[PDB]
Write a protein that binds this ligand. Structure first.
Ligand code: NAG
Ligand code: MAN
Ligand code: MAN
Ligand code: FUC
Lengths: 145, 192, 48, 319, 287, 48
């Protein structure tokens, strides 16, 4: 392995931060951002009604798949038995954002409210924030032009 | 050596072959630190970029000082990447952020560590501001121990006086030029 | 036996268009076969 | 037993974005900052909305950065002024080769191939004191200084060459924190009982008789043995001191420091700390660590049991 | 759970009209994602039609005082005939130079053994690596060398890497857990009689045994093992921030082919090839 | 899995035997000549 490695742990920067020395790069940076935000808006597992048995969903192009936990199987991870320590119940998970509210005082808002089958059987609450608020796009429209 | 299950205690054959290999590639096990910003001497505008770089370290600490982390389990030091805290664990503590213990380590309970500074208390009636911290990550309850390093700071209430207008370029060697040679002087004219 | 369809019907008319598939000989149930499927047993799209 | 021992997930929160800072000429950008209201920890949602923003922007002053004349030191093609002694050095002290590219016969290159001190570039990395991990390559710890000074690790070892950033290095073998802790708990139980009973009774001519009896024996056990062994050894094969003055900074560090704007910017000067780290090792134990915890549990249970019972009931009648 | 077949949304309102292609693309985003063995959305996530644009195609621009490669990337004139390949793919900096003008750039050509993976892109949501984003090997006419204390070799580093360390760590965790059980059991019963009678001569006699038995046994055993182990051979590999990363030729080509008007279909094509992020730093090692 | 290949997205340099059937395709539509290109050179090119 010292003579043929792989990447093992990673710290990340968003891809859009790289765009440099191409035509319109200034604009392309923001557009690759909004496109990444919209890519994430397609890809975020929130679209998938959650896998059972602690499996994590992912988006295939226009479709959902499950990273099941070991020796529990099938498309929803319903069949078989888990291995290792188990907490019981069902830990909570989000459905996708309600689309951003129109701007007030330079800021949007959006809300997600754990609307998939709720944290149950003593399982932990959904990991995240119910609401976000973000500054509006008008500085691109005025400034980059 | 890492593969050895350990039921025997140390197998000196493996431990010695490893230890000989440690001579061939070490890792930093303990260390004594000086701040990055003391180093720099080559760069144009060294002194200016240095001043700004101390100043950024102060702001960086104000933003990313892991004092802001929730109390570390089992007396680990809190440490912050920028976007997540993780706890640095004590010998006999493990898990992602020190949540669990070896059966011997449970005996300690010493528990002496800080939470963040308050913001500055404004000038102390000799024009010095100050701030304090309160030993208030999970407290020295069952056992007893002091959190380390002075509880309070005093810092002169310094602020700006003049119109900002950018910054000047400064380099370490230059300023002691009380004398330097007469220039090429192509605008011929006359000296004094 | 593992299932696969016949060739799909080419299209229906424009203004919403459909393709359809069957397994009449192919099907799993004779001698207690496996999965019948790998995709959509019927398919439809916009004309443009 | 425990479950969900790992503590409740703090999800990150960041403030509202500040102003777009005074627009930096030489970078041709303006930076919008935001601060942390609570970090993520125990596995909460990260600060996934990215923590800083830069907008392309029109300058509003000239750039005031100087060029280095550097008093007869040798300006390499990437702009480092190396020591004048190293002109036509041999080896390559610029990294760029500018020191040697066109020359007559060089100054004396060393009498042999020599390897550097083991792991020596770690002594030239930075450390992020807030995050407990390395960052940067702050010093080029493959810089040779144009000289052939050497240290011997063992009679069996090859000789090693000292990079000019180090004031001293010692090879040793040590154990400098040494810890073995062990526990045993052993428990055995042995239980048993055994028994018997008997009896009989008695009472036209007519007569009646009875008998009964019983036996039992049982033995049982539980045993536990559970044992623990934690060994922590800190071993210190190298120890070092980095110089007090004139350290050779890495190419990739010396690049970033020059690039920084002369006017302040919080995000730009802050990335130096994500990139290069906060502090560097002035001295330290380039050592090894072994940490070992071996926990064992064993538990056992047993039974044996036996029983019998009997009864008899008889009568005679006659005339 | 019930199989979910996908559903298309109604189309988006086309796009800003593309100045180079003279076309417009409309998105067809997803109303319901297919799940639980149900179908993906049949057909195309976009469609495109001709359109006369008020938008210009952006021109594309070269290098001025800097040298230019065949791709259109720009490189310093101090890197022409440096004898490394400074142009990422096409090495126009190495075309037809004289052996009298050529010079050594460094003693060796070998990198750390998979430095390439450090410059890959990263798709956070599939979890996978994505294709070559940072040029991992812009040597930059420099002889930044390291002796690796592992695999026992000298290597060359690029000015794109902030730090290549050569620390080793190996961290191992084992859990082994075991059960075994066994039982045996026996039951017996018997119920019995006799009678004899004589009268005068005549007589009769009888006897019985009902008798019964039962046994059972069970055994059960399970053994479960986990090992997780990590190896490292460089532990912070740090890529620089975007001010000093130099990009891969085909990724930088895609950044030039990106439309500068907001076609969502066009910007997906970069994100699918190169991911959501680049690896800013990491451990290169093994698992 | 001890190599990973990715082909460039475009600006490609073609193998001359393919290039010569492509220069021999009609601009008129008649499926048979186009069918032989897929027979000789495949339906899709390998990109990753
Ligand atoms: C390093 O540790 C050794 C023991 O190996 C000691 O003799 C030496 O003085 C220490 N070096 C310094 C000066 O830190
Ligand atoms: C007929 O139509 C589709 C085209 O989308 C084919 O892929 C499939 O064979 C179906 O039966
Ligand atoms: C798609 O169609 C919408 C209709 O609202 C237009 O507004 C847009 O310009 C695009 O052509
Ligand atoms: C909300 C989190 O999940 C569970 C709750 O019982 C606790 O309040 C915890 O903080």
């Amino acid at each position: 392995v010292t003579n043929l490695p792989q990447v093992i742990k990673q710290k990340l920067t968003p891809l859009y931060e790289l765009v440099k020395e191409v035509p319109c790069a200034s604009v392309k940076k923001l557009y690759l951002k909004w496109a990444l935000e919209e890519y994430l808006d397609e890809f975020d597992p929130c679209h998938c009604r959650p896998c059972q048995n602690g499996g994590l969903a992912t988006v295939e192009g226009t479709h959902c798949l499950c990273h099941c936990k070991p020796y529990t199987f099938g498309a929803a991870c319903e069949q078989g038995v888990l291995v290792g320590n188990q907490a019981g119940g069902v830990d909570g998970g989000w459905s996708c954002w309600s689309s951003w509210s129109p701007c007030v005082q330079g800021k949007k808002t959006r809300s997600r409210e754990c609307n998939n089958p709720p944290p149950s059987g003593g399982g932990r609450s959904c990991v995240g924030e119910t609401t976000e608020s973000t500054q509006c796009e008008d500085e691109e429209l005025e400034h980059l032009r | 050596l890492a593969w050895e299950k350990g039921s025997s205690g140390l197998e000196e054959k493996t431990f010695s072959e490893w230890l000989e290999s440690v001579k061939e590639n070490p890792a930093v096990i303990d260390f004594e630190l000086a701040p990055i910003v003391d180093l720099v001497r080559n760069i144009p505008c060294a002194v200016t970029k240095r001043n700004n770089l101390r100043k950024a370290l102060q702001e960086y600490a104000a933003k990313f000082d892991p004092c802001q982390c929730a109390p570390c389990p089992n007396n680990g030091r809190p440490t912050l990447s920028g976007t997540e805290c993780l706890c640095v664990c004590q010998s006999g503590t493990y898990g992602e952020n020190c949540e669990k213990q070896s059966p011997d380590y449970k005996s300690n309970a010493v528990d002496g560590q800080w939470g963040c500074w308050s913001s500055w208390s404004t000038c102390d009636a000799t024009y010095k501001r100050s701030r304090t911290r309160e030993c208030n990550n999970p407290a020295p309850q069952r056992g007893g121990k002091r959190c380390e390093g002075e509880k309070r700071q005093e810092e002169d209430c310094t602020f700006s006086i003049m119109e900002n207008n950018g910054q000047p370029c400064i380099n370490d060697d230059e300023e002691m030029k009380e004398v330097d040679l007469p220039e090429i002087e192509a605008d011929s004219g006359c000296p004094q | 036996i593992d299932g696969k369809w016949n060739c799909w019907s080419n299209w229906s008319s424009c203004s919403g268009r459909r393709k359809t598939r069957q397994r009449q000989c192919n099907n799993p149930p004779p001698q207690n076969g496996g999965s019948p499927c790998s995709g959509p047993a019927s398919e439809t799209l916009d004309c443009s | 037993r425990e479950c969900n021992w790992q503590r409740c997930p703090i999800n990150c929160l960041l403030g509202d974005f500040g102003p777009w800072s005074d627009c930096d000429p030489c970078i041709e950008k303006q930076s919008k900052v935001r601060s942390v209201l609570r970090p993520s920890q125990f596995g909460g949602q990260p600060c996934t909305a990215p923590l800083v923003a830069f907008q392309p922007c029109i300058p509003s002053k000239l750039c005031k950065i100087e060029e280095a004349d550097c008093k007869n030191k040798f300006r390499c093609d990437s702009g480092r002024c190396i020591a004048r002694k190293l002109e036509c050095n041999g080896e390559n002290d610029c990294g760029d080769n500018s020191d040697e590219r066109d020359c007559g016969r060089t100054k004396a290159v060393c009498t042999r191939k020599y390897n550097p001190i083991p792991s020596v570039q770690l002594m030239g990395n930075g450390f992020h004191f807030l995050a407990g991990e390395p960052r940067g390559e702050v010093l080029d710890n493959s810089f040779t200084g144009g000289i052939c000074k050497t240290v011997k690790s063992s009679r069996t070892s090859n000789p090693y060459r000292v990079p000019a950033n180090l004031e001293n290095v010692g090879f040793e073998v040590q154990t400098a924190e040494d810890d073995l802790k062990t526990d045993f708990y052993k428990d055995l139980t042995s239980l048993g009982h055994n028994e018997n009973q008997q009896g009989s009774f008695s009472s036209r001519s007519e007569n009646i008789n009875h008998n009964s009896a019983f036996k039992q024996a049982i033995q049982a056990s539980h045993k536990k043995d559970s044992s623990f062994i934690r060994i922590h050894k800190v071993m210190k094969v190298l120890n070092f001191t980095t110089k007090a003055k004139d350290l050779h900074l890495s190419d990739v560090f010396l690049k970033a420091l020059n690039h920084l704007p002369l006017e302040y910017n919080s995000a730009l000067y802050s990335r130096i700390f994500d990139d290069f780290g906060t502090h560097y090792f002035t001295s330290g134990s380039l050592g090894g660590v072994y940490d070992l915890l071996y926990q064992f549990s064993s538990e056992e249970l047993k039974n044996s049991g036996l029983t019998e019972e009997e009864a008899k009931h008889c009568v005679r009648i006659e005339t | 759970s019930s199989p979910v077949n996908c559903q298309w949304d109604f189309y988006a309102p086309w796009s800003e009209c593309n100045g180079c292609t003279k076309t417009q693309t409309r998105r067809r985003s997803v109303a319901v994602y297919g799940q639980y063995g149900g179908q993906p959305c049949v057909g195309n996530a976009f469609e495109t039609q001709s359109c006369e644009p008020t938008r210009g195609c952006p021109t594309e621009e070269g290098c001025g005082e800097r040298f230019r490669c065949f791709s259109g990337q720009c490189i310093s004139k101090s890197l022409v005939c440096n004898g490394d390949s400074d142009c990422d793919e096409d090495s126009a900096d190495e075309d037809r130079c004289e052996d009298s003008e050529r010079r050594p750039s460094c003693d060796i050509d070998k990198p750390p053994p998979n430095i390439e993976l450090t410059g890959n892109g990263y798709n956070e949501l599939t979890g996978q690596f994505r294709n070559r984003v940072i040029n991992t090997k812009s040597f930059g006419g420099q002889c930044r060398k390291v002796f690796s204390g592992d695999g026992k070799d000298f290597y060359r580093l690029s000015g794109n890497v902030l730090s290549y360390t050569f620390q080793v760590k190996i961290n191992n965790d084992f859990n082994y857990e075991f059960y075994n059980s066994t039982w045996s059991y026996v039951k017996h019963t018997s119920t019995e009689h006799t009678s004899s009678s004589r009268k005068r001569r005549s007589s009769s006699s009888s006897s019985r045994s009902y008798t019964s038995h039962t046994n059972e046994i069970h055994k059960g055993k399970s053994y479960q093992l986990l090992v997780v182990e990590n190896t490292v051979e460089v532990a912070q590999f740090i890529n620089n921030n975007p001010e000093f990363l130099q990009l891969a030729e085909p990724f930088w080509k895609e950044l030039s082919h990106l439309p500068s008007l907001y076609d969502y279909s066009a910007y997906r094509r970069l994100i699918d090839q190169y991911g959501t992020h680049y690896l800013q730093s990491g451990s290169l090692g093994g698992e | 899995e001890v190599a990973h290949y990715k082909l460039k997205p475009r600006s490609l340099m073609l193998h001359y035997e393919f290039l010569q059937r492509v220069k021999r395709l009609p601009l008129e539509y008649s499926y048979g000549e186009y069918r032989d290109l897929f027979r000789d050179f495949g339906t899709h090119y390998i990109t990753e």
